[PDB]
Structure 1
Amino acid sequence: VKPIFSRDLNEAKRRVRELYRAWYREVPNTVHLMQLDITVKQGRDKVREMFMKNAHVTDPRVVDLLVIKGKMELQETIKVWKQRTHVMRFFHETETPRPKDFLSKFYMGHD
């Protein structure tokens, strides 16, 4: 298969570490400048749990495309093309989470 940037997994992991460093650098500017209704600590934990959401993939081209999608999110976060509405739909302040046990999923719907 043809590569994208990375000939292995650890170089793309270093690119993931660079993007996480730049996101952790960027996010208090987009807490203070955004007039946002959060602190910086659970925003950084939201960045960390969004990194841990796609933690299971060991594929280098998939994580390189995750690197360019995180770079586009970084490009729309360093500049303020995203707003205070778009920037924190990730927190799910309104949508209730779907329950994971069998009994509440039995009570809620045919799933």
Structure 2
Amino acid sequence: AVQPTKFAVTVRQSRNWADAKQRVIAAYRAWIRAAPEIQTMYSIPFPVSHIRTRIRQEFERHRYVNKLNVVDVLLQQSNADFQETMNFWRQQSHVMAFFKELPSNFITGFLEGRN
């Protein structure tokens, strides 16, 4: 067959919640380990602290998931997004599209038009 690429990971299902628990930590660790390496690959002018902050928030939005089959789709997406980033397939515009650098009240929203 054709060779899987450098960070290609075989798609496998989580055995139990302990499996998923350990994989999510492995994925979060691997992301924040790579933040210094992302910065010089993509010439990020922000410091690495901001990059790791964004990694933390992406993981935090899936914090309250209690379904193995939703976590494994999520562990799939991060694996592909990690592989995509580390092999430098995406470019600076894609990585900067990921950093964003709604009205806070009804009355603020009303006065400007909806938002």
Kept in 2, the 8 Å contact 1:9–1:58? The answer is no
One-letter code aligned to 2:105 = D
CA distance in 2, matches of 1:10, 1:99: 41
CA distance in 2, matches of 1:83, 1:15: 27
CA distance in 1, matches of 2:17, 2:108: 40
The Cα of 1:76 is off from its aligned counterpart by 0.6
The answer for unaligned runs of 5 or more in structure 2 is 1-11
The answer for unaligned runs of 5 or more in structure 1 is none
Change (3 A) 1:105 1:55: farther
The Cα of 1:37 is off from its aligned counterpart by 1.9
Q: Does 1:82 align with 2:86?
A: no
Secondary structure (helix, strand or coil) at the match of 1:81 reads: coil
Q: How does 1:6-17 map onto structure 2 within 5 Å?
A: 6-17=14-25
The Cα of 1:110 is off from its aligned counterpart by 4.5
Q: Does 1:92 align with 2:96?
A: no
Aligned residues: 104
Q: Deviations along 1:64-106, whole A, 9 cap, x unmatched? A: 110010000000111100111101222213xxxx124322233
CA distance in 1, matches of 2:72, 2:34: 21
TM-score by length of structure 1 reads: 0.81
User: Which contiguous aligned blocks of 4+ residues in structure 1 show a shift greater than 6 angstroms?
Assistant: none
Identical amino acids, percent of aligned pairs: 35
Q: 1:19 aligns with which of 21, 27, 35?
A: 27
CA distance in 2, matches of 1:103, 1:13: 43
